[model samples]
Target: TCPFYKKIPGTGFTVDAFQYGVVEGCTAYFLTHFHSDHYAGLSKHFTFPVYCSEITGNLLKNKLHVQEQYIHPLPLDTECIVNGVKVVLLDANHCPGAVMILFYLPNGTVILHTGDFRADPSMERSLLADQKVHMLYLDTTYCSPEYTFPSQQEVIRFAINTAFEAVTLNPHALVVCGTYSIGKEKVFLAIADVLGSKVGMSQEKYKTLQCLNIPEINSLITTDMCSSLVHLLPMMQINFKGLQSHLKKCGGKYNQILAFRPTGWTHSNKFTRIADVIPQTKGNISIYGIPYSEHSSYLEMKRFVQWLKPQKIIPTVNVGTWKSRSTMEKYFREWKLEAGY
Candidate 1:
């Protein structure tokens, strides 16, 4: 059943009630980003004329390689009416193609759905304030204040500094920085920018970076241009040890290896085990510990909720109703009930 047409179980289906399931006469749907969570049910459940930002459309095309016919591109701040629902897209700094969506109904009720956003002032300033949002569907992935994350720039700096220091200390080492092909392309760019003429990437990294269409870093090199400053490090999207073994094999040709920790490894015990496998005599294998999280921190989430000041706060993409409900309650309490919604 189409998400816009079928009624979701548990959530009542009524034309007058604000429900979670599909409405009988629903006209349109909005995709906030290309993240699996946001677009999971897209091609499967909901086939409505989906809307997204131009960059998001490009990302879907270039990254996910999805068909163009399924997407409707809209510029930032522009409003369009599809099936009586007014839709707007706003910058979501969580990732390059992420966006915050605003859905307005003719009945004066508005819904602001934040796909996944951060509190970077530059990104926030680009969002048009919603003074009359009756409901908000927010991403509370990091709803606890304990989950503070550093700025993107700071994380990039840490990675570059660590890589450079390791390489300088041992010139013959092969540095293996682990990151997602699409998400961590920025970290690779930072490496290239700082390493300058010395940066050399493996064909795999070069291809992945190019697929992302990063101009600043992409313009600097190609497969023909090879140097020792950096190496295109590729890891099995799933296998951590496999990536480490690949790096070790590369060690046959190079003396130094600088490995950047992959995301989600910080929270697992396997990260330590991986480090332990590195031979002590491998000419200084440095593990740069930089927190490059994709989600907004707790404070950022709070500020966003407060700024929007919606009438009701809703947390989608959560595990269960209990967890989501608890998170919403916690947000309200922490903000001293200041979050009107």
Candidate 2:
């Protein structure tokens, strides 16, 4: 995306640096989380002051090994000023330390950057409850009504049940979950709390969770496979072809592998609300693609936009991608909403 360099109505504070990894002409750099896509090419260090949650700042310090002084930790819900723009960080509900930034420009223009969030509806009642949002940079992961799926809680309950029940029925098999670097810690926590078992994952993931200091996750994770041998791994490893590489760790003797991927893509390209499961009788791995996502679903995003009523709706993916204005017009025309005024 090219620079969206919006100068606050009166402050002259710019929001371009946040758009560009190699940035310029901005008051400060604000980070939403440690997501690879969001923080791509961004380093632990920066020439300008970086603002982010204390957890993310710590992540940069320990994981990326960035020095402390460069990172100015911004706690959630706190109001602070950069130049003359008043900024507040609200919980994004997407991942640990993820925040939705609200900018109150001096000239009364309010901008909202919903930096990757799962809509909880309640936050809207608090954050945008009364304010008029001038601009809303939305997360459009499920931008179509065809992508409807169950809520994260319901699907997660299904996932936990499926995995644990499978494992209980077949003790010889090990349950493996596909997840991101930071999201989906609750799965591991619930499994441990409910079944009283230890979950295994990458050192990077373990360390990230450790830094979050979420007690629910703290007591559930391990770098090494514990007695239960239930592994929560990156999404890529869930493939039967890719899984073979890691199967060697089990001495080529593990009885079975049950893989669960908690993602919105489980119902990709079609209409589906229930969880979809595919059992590979021929393949060694049994895969279940459940609809458990941190990003808002199509309905969630749509309802949010209706509530926001922003003057301009900039779909997060559009800005600098050379998306034809006519194409966006046609897209929104079919979606039954207004866009590109």
Candidate 2 structure quality by residue, lDDT tens digits, 1-341 = 43453333354344324445544455566778877776655565555677788888878788877777778887777778766568898988898888888998777789888878887788777756767888877776666566666776777677677767877887777777777677877766665555667788777877777788576665577787745557877887778876766666767456678777766555353654455544554466787767667888777876677667677766664445555444554555544455333
Top candidate, metric lDDT: 2
Return the top candidate by TM-score.
2
Q: Candidate 1 on 1-341: residue-level lDDT in tens?
A: 34322221222221112224454554444556655655553332334455677766766565555667766778877887655556677777777666777766666677666767666555445545535677766677777656765566766776777667666777665655555444655676677667664345556556545544355654665564234545555544223444456556554666545666546324533244332333233334555545677777777777766775666666654636686667668766667466544
lDDT of 1: 0.58
Q: Each model's TM-score, in the order given?
A: 0.75, 0.85
TM-score of 2: 0.85
TM-score, prediction 1: 0.75
Q: List the residue pairs that clash in candidate 1.
A: 172-255, 172-256, 173-255, 173-256, 174-256, 175-258, 198-229, 200-230, 201-232, 202-232
Error of 2 at 240 (Å): 2.3
